């Protein structure tokens, strides 16, 4: 192919509690990244047989 | 338990005297230091089976 992928992710947070209480929960986010290839770089040279012989 | 204890105390004082005088007497003082633990800290994360399978 002509692409590649890499993932990303977030962090968490701390909280506090006392007896008789229930714990709370939070979500976590994510995203992505992509790169592509688009161009060829070159260099060329030509010569003739008669010139090469002399 | 949920408590800890430490002790504290004071010092003395110097005085002067001349012939015929009685000696004064001073009382030292006391106290205490106590520390308690009450709060719990946590982090929680939850996921769903339908999202786990894919």
Other C-beta atoms lying within 10 Å of the C-beta of residue B43:
13
Those of residues 16-35 in A touching chain B at CB distance below 8 A are 16-18, 23-26, 28
> Could you tell me if residue B36 is left (phi over 0), alpha (psi between -120 and 50 degrees) or otherwise beta?
beta
Q: How far apart are CA A33 and CA A9, in angstroms?
A: 12
Q: Token pair of B33, please?
A: 């230091």
Alpha carbons B40 and B4: distance in angstroms, whole number: 18
Which experimental approach was used here?
Answer: cryo-EM
Report CB contact under 8 Å: A25, B46. yes
Question: CB-based contact (8 Å) between B45 and chain A?
Answer: yes
Q: Which two tokens stand for residue B44?
A: 């929680």
Q: Is B41 on the interface with A (CB under 8 A)?
A: yes
Q: For residue B44, which of A7, A16, A19, A30 has the smallest C-alpha distance?
A: A16
Q: Going along chain A, which residue ranges are E strands?
A: 3-9, 15-17, 30-36
A17–B40: do the CB atoms touch at under 8 Å? yes
């Amino acid at each position: 192919s002509n692409q590649a992928r890499i993932d990303r992710m977030n962090t968490v947070t701390i909280k506090g509690r006392t007896p008789g209480q229930k714990l709370d929960r939070e979500s976590v986010k994510n995203d992505k990244l992509v790169i592509t290839v688009d161009t060829v770089t070159y260099a060329s040279t030509v010569m003739d047989w008669q010139d090469d012989w002399t």
